[PDB]
């Protein structure tokens, strides 16, 4: 498969958020809870690798706007800096309520404020759900979060016929188109870090036309200087299947683009998007859960997740599964949240640098894997304190002229 190409003439016109066709809710919202025997007075195990106690000396990232394009966010007394951006699933929404439990976890992991004897906003005006003392703290409590509701599992079309296109593929084309619009809109809001935690897997056989998405990525990355960070994709999703790695018999291409079988988008645009893989709390890669494509660029923790509870007012560890079973979340959708926090802290300390330079600062300071560059993890494991203080060369990586 040939690497992506871009035609900037395909930009979608700007406009207020709204679906392409009328939709209705089909399922009840997901319940949440805590696993037996947990004790929230201890820090989450993933916070040891980040060494936050040393990183916060230079600041907490005040004045940075981070856009969360996902399943929306529900307000909570610990998120005093949340802004309603828009909704693409329901015409009357604004992106400030998540029926799937995914959205509020990702956001709270970035900006939740630490505990205090009294909360700044004790009022609780939040609306009901729609029908058909504590050690936790975010990576950057000072940021400002913009919520945009891009996707959800609970909703469906209320005229299901789709003509000459298979109802399975007909939805993919709507998603690719609806994704480009959200990236353009979020850039005009002035966000400086755009975080994407939901992605599509597609077969390499007759890939869907992405011209509209290609121009949309370029516009936000160059003309608006935004840093785009995306998850490598959880392997339990409906169509994601594992990709092959480097092949010693063909040193022709070291990242092996010619052997690809599954394409992940927007993660695909390795020239403008930063893709994050996952590792456990000890440092080993989650070989069985993250897609090892050739576009992967960095990795961060992804287990022992903790976050603010939607529909309640406390913490949670798990979500109510299909059966009575209480199921624990894990995967790349959360690792991308960790890096979104580190990117916010770095470009608060070096405000003169552009997006292409901030990315090089994170890549060069990471601990690398045995092969130097790999596919399950990109250049290595993210490292906060190193990114904030080492003297990185301003130019990209270059090979030596002669070795003898």
């Amino acid at each position: 498969i040939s690497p992506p190409t871009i035609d900037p003439g395909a930009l979608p016109p700007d406009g207020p958020p709204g679906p392409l066709a009328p939709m209705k809710q089909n399922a009840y919202c997901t319940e949440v809870g805590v696993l037996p025997g947990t004790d929230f007075q201890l820090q989450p195990k993933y916070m040891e690798m980040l060494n936050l106690n040393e990183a916060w000396q230079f600041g907490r990232g005040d004045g940075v706007k981070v856009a969360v394009i996902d399943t929306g966010v529900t307000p909570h007394p610990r998120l005093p800096r949340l802004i309603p951006g828009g909704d693409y699933v329901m015409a009357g929404g604004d992106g400030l309520s998540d029926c799937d439990a995914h959205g509020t976890l990702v956001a709270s992991m970035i900006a939740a404020v630490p505990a205090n004897g009294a909360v700044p906003l004790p009022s609780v005006p939040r609306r009901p759900v729609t029908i058909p003392p504590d050690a936790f703290s975010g990576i950057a409590p000072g940021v400002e979060i913009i919520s945009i509701r891009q996707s959800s599992q609970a909703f469906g079309l209320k005229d299901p016929y789709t003509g000459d296109e298979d109802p399975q593929t007909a939805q993919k084309i709507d998603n690719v188109e609806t994704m480009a619009r959200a990236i353009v809109h979020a850039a005009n809001m002035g966000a400086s870090v755009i975080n994407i935690s939901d992605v599509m897997c597609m077969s390499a056989r007759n890939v869907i036309d992405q011209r509209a998405l290609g121009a949309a990525v370029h516009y936000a990355a160059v003309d608006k200087d935004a840093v785009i960070v995306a998850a490598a994709g959880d392997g339990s999703k409906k169509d994601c299947k594992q990709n092959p790695i480097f092949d010693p018999l063909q040193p022709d291409d070291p990242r092996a683009w010619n052997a690809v079988t599954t394409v992940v988008t927007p993660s695909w645009f390795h020239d403008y998007v930063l893709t994050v893989g996952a590792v456990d709390a000890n440092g080993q890669p989650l070989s069985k859960m993250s897609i090892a494509g050739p576009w992967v660029s960095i990795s961060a923790p992804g287990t022992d997740v903790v976050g603010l509870s939607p529909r309640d007012d406390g913490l949670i560890n798990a979500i109510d599964g299909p059966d009575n079973s209480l199921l624990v979340p894990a995967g790349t959708s959360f690792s991308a949240a960790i890096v979104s926090g580190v990117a916010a802290l770095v470009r608060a300390k070096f405000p003169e640098l552009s997006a292409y330079q901030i990315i090089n600062r994170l890549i060069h300071t990471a601990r690398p894997p045995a092969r130097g560059v790999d596919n399950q993890v990109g250049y290595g494991v993210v490292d906060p304190v190193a990114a904030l203080t080492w003297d990185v060369p301003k130019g990209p990586a270059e090979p030596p002229k002669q070795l003898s």
Partner: protein, 70 residues
Amino acid sequence: SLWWVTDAGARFGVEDSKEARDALGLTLTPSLAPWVALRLLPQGPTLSRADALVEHDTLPMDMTPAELVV
């Protein structure tokens, strides 16, 4: 021109000079061979003292190799 052929089928050029000969051995007189045949064997670098005098930290990798099948 003088050439040295290895059992693996590769040929290497050898310098005519006293230094190169005396260092490798090769004092005896060589046998004759026809160029239309000898050119069919793969060629390696020439064994010259002047280019052996080099240091390296790591070596370059070989493009387009072949599979060893057990």
